[PDB]
Amino acid sequence: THWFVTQRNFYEPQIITTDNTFVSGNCDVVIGIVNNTVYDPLQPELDS
Amino acid sequence: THWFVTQRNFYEPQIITTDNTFVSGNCDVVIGIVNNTVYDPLQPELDS
Ligand SMILES: *[C@@H]1O[C@H](CO)[C@@H](O[C@@H]2O[C@H](CO)[C@@H](O)[C@H](O)[C@H]2NC(C)=O)[C@H](O)[C@H]1NC(C)=O
Ligand SMILES: *[C@@H]1O[C@H](CO)[C@@H](O)[C@H](O)[C@H]1NC(C)=O
Numbered sequence A, B: 001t002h003w004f005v006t007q008r009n010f011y012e013p014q015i016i017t018t019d020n021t022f023v024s025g026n027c028d029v030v031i032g033i034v035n036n037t038v039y040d041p042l043q044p045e046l047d048s
Helices: A043-047 B042-048
Strands: none
Touching: none
């Protein structure tokens, strides 16, 4: 029901964030890519 | 003409940032160092 990121060797999920991820290129390149709402921890801290 | 940071074993350049570089000391102690702009993502993000 919800996507997470975990270390490969012991199941301990976390929210998918721009601190837990990095970017290259665009979605039409990766074969088997998926849609997901990636948290940017700066946006609440700019708005509030 | 421009300076990039890239992974050692496959050329894939990135504009040099505070997310890709760490800091120590000052520019006098290093040998063969050069001047270039470091992109700080936070200045556009605060000013937006
Ligand atoms: C991820 O979401 C995007 C939209 O944000 C999907 O893009 C659609 O792709 C279909 C097939 O070509 C088009 O008919 C739609 O018009 C597109 N939507 C928009 C808003 O442009 C994309 O297909 C989704 N990918 C996955 C794997 O779910
Ligand atoms: C590299 O070697 C040249 C001599 O060929 C010297 O002039 C230059 O200052 C050296 N640069 C660094 C970073 O060591």
